[PDB]
Amino acid sequence: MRNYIQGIDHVQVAAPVGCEEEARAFYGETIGMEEIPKPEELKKRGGCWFKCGNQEIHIGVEQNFNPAKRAHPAFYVLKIDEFKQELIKQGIEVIDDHARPDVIRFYVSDPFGNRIEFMENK
Amino acid sequence: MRNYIQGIDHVQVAAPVGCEEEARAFYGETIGMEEIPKPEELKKRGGCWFKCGNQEIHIGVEQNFNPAKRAHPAFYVLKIDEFKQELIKQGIEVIDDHARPDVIRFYVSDPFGNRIEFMENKN
Question: Where is the VOC domain positioned along the sequence (chain A) (predicted)?
Fold first, then answer.
């Protein structure tokens, strides 16, 4: 078979109804992603989209939300140790991980309890 | 604040213990992604990694696996039309989505019940 898949366009992360202020304050303010406008048709669904490099993260509203604690997206970060201190400074709780040896990584939870990984190569 | 975040490096998709054969059959054979060897130190954890463009998908083993039927990763596809009919040819069930009119897209479930989305911009 031919090679159709070109990469990850975006990841969708779930959140409850009314999540927007908190989503904006964490993804936008705190970790510093740029919010982007949703397509006109999809606005009526609630939620927020944010840009990270050539990819996006779509925070989507769910009727019966449960956070994703295991499966999760991993974002590549420049200057990870500087970024991490910027998070710690803002009261974000971080969890370091040394299991993968040529990579620096840590985990955080978004305001809704969803697992996020940040990594950079050593 | 400076702009530290560069992109999505990978997505971790959960699966049960013993999933490797079924994961390779679907992610590798069916959808056609290239299997990537895991770091030596991580072998014992089970699971498999597949390449997609400058990104990866990591299938990670979970004893307490719960499939992600709603929140999911979305993969960009060239010639999605033709990709979709290649999946149907192989007996894969596809669920089209027409809500976003600038984009063609559809969902499938992997063998463990996780939702995956495929999309392409319209020309």
Answer: 7-121
Reported resolution in A? 1.9
CATH code for position A79: 3.10.180.10
* B79 to chain A, closest Cα gap in Å: 7
Count of domains for chain A: 1
Give the nearest chain A residue to B84 (CA atoms).
Answer: A4
Strand ranges inside chain A, DSSP E:
5-15, 34-36, 48-52, 55-61, 72-77, 95-97, 103-109, 115-121
- Whether residue B114 lies inside any domain: the answer is yes
Contact assessment for residue B56 and residue B49, using Cβ atoms and an 8 Å cutoff: yes
- Closest residue in B to A15 (Cα–Cα): B71
Residue B65 lies in a domain: yes
Residue A58 lies in a domain: yes
- Chain B residues in contact with A107 by the CB 8 A cut-off are none
Closest CA relative to residue A110, chosen from A41, A10, A2, A14: A14
d(CA A113, CA B100): 28
Report the residue from B6, B71, B101 with minimal CB separation from A60: B71
Q: Which of B55, B70, B100 sits opposite A14 (nearest CB)?
A: B70
A2 domain residue, yes or no:
no
